[PDB]
């Protein structure tokens, strides 16, 4: 039974989530999550997405999706590929033009963006720990 989360993190299913605040570009958020022993959030189901939207900032948040090698394939920071997606209409933009980072809007839907864009929120996740 794995639902144990650290103080300030919120459990959903087998993961823990931290809804961060404070102005950060994508890689800044990446390291903020890393320094908290987590990583920018990966999303693999509509149930997970719905949970995130419920707790997420109205003004948009960095998540852990990025065009890894700059060549057009978006990969989650945890290493996994996209199965579930929640792209906003028309996203991602059908051009390789250096908008390699993904944010989640107030609606929960995703759009690509310049990685140096400063957003006011960012979400981390980590595995919940378990009772023996
Ligand atoms: Ca776009």
Numbering used by the authors: 159 to 290
Article passage:
The second principal receptor for IgE, CD23, is a type II transmembrane glycoprotein with a C-type lectin-like domain (CTLD)4 (3, 4).
To resolve the controversy, the crystal structure of Ca2+-bound wild-type human derCD23 was solved. The electron density for the Ca2+-coordinating ligands (Glu-249, Thr-251, Asp-270, and three water molecules) and the Ca2+ ion itself is well defined in three of the derCD23 molecules; electron density for the three water molecules and Thr-251 in the fourth molecule is unclear. The coordination geometry is pentagonal bipyramidal formed by the seven ligands. Surprisingly, in contrast to Wurzburg et al., we found that the highly conserved Asn-269 residue is not directly involved in the binding of Ca2+; the nitrogen atom of the carboxamide group was found to form a hydrogen bond with a water molecule that acts as a Ca2+ ligand. In the Ca2+-bound structure, Pro-250 adopts a cis configuration in all four copies, and the distance between Thr-251 (Oγ1) and Glu-249 (Oϵ1) is 3.7 Å. In the presence of Ca2+, Pro-250 is effectively locked into the cis configuration. The structure of Ca2+-bound derCD23 reported here shows a single ion bound at the principal calcium site, liganded by Glu-249, Thr-251, Asp-270, and three water molecules; the KD is 1.5 mm.
